[PDB]
Amino acid sequence: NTTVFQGVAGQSLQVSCPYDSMKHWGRRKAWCRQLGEKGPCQRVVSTHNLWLLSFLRRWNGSTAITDDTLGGTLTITLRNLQPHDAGLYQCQSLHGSEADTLRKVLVEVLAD
Ligand SMILES: *[C@@H]1O[C@H](CO)[C@@H](O)[C@H](O)[C@H]1NC(C)=O
């Protein structure tokens, strides 16, 4: 059961990944995109490298990430949604070599 997010193309879309603020305390977060089914997942952007500053927005081009570590809500903004921006993404909580999956989403688009 993934979840879906619909966006009008040319205007911005926000996705929210809720999580347990305590379970993932001190953990960096990342937003990545999927290719085909089984893999790979490729990192688009991660929250600030210093956890106390993860409330700072981070950008990879048109994609922004911000983390509310106290309330436990990660928020990704796809500014100016595009057709090619559509696809299957996930939010990740990182620890050591591994990453755990916080939420799994599709993005949809409509022109005009
Ligand atoms: C930023 O650009 C795209 C995100 O869509 C990705 O392929 C690339 O690896 C990103 N850069 C880094 C350093 O993660």
Residue numbers in the entry: 20 to 131
Q: What do the study authors state?
A:
TREM2 is an innate immune receptor expressed on dendritic cells (DCs), resident macrophages such as osteoclasts and microglia, infiltrating and inflammatory macrophages, and CSF monocytes (Colonna and Wang, 2016). It is a type one receptor protein consisting of an extracellular V-type Ig domain, a short stalk, a transmembrane domain that associates with the adaptor protein DAP12 for signaling, and a cytoplasmic tail. For example, whole genome and whole exome sequencing has identified point mutations in the gene encoding the protein TREM2 (triggering receptor expressed on myeloid cells 2) that correlate with a significantly increased risk of developing Alzheimer’s disease (AD). We found that NHD-causing mutations impact TREM2 protein folding and stability, whereas AD risk variants decrease binding to the cellular TREM2-ligand (TREM2-L).
We previously reported the crystallization of the WT human TREM2 ectodomain (amino acids 19–134) purified from a mammalian cell expression system. We determined the crystal structure of the TREM2 ectodomain at 3.1 Å resolution and found that the disease-linked mutations exhibit distinct structural patterns, suggesting that they would impact TREM2 function through alternate mechanisms. The TREM2 ectodomain is a V-type Ig domain containing two disulfide bonds, the canonical Ig disulfide between residues C36 and C110 (βB–βF) and an additional linkage between C51 and C60 (βC-βC’). A single N-acetylglucosamine (NAG) glycan that remains after Endo Hf treatment is clearly visible in the electron density at residue N79. The nine β-strands characteristic of proteins within this Ig domain class are present, and two short α-helix passages are observed spanning β-sheets B–C and E–F. The asymmetric unit (ASU) contains two monomers of hTREM2 in a parallel arrangement, but the limited buried surface area (~400 Å2) and chemical nature of the interface suggest that this dimer would not exist in solution. The side chains of mutations causing NHD (Y38, T66 and V126) are all buried within the core of the Ig fold, whereas the side chains of verified AD risk variants (R47H and R62H) and possible AD risk variants (N68K, D87N and T96K) all lie on the protein surface. R47, the residue with the strongest link to AD as the R47H variant, is at the end of the loop preceding β-sheet C. It is well-ordered in the structure with the side chain lying parallel along the surface of the protein, and the side-chain amines engage the carbonyl oxygen of T66. Indeed, anionic bacterial carbohydrates, phospholipids, myelin lipids, and even purified DNA all activate TREM2 reporter cell lines. This is not surprising in light of our crystal structure, which reveals an extended basic patch on the surface of TREM2 that would be capable of forming electrostatic interactions with these anionic ligands.
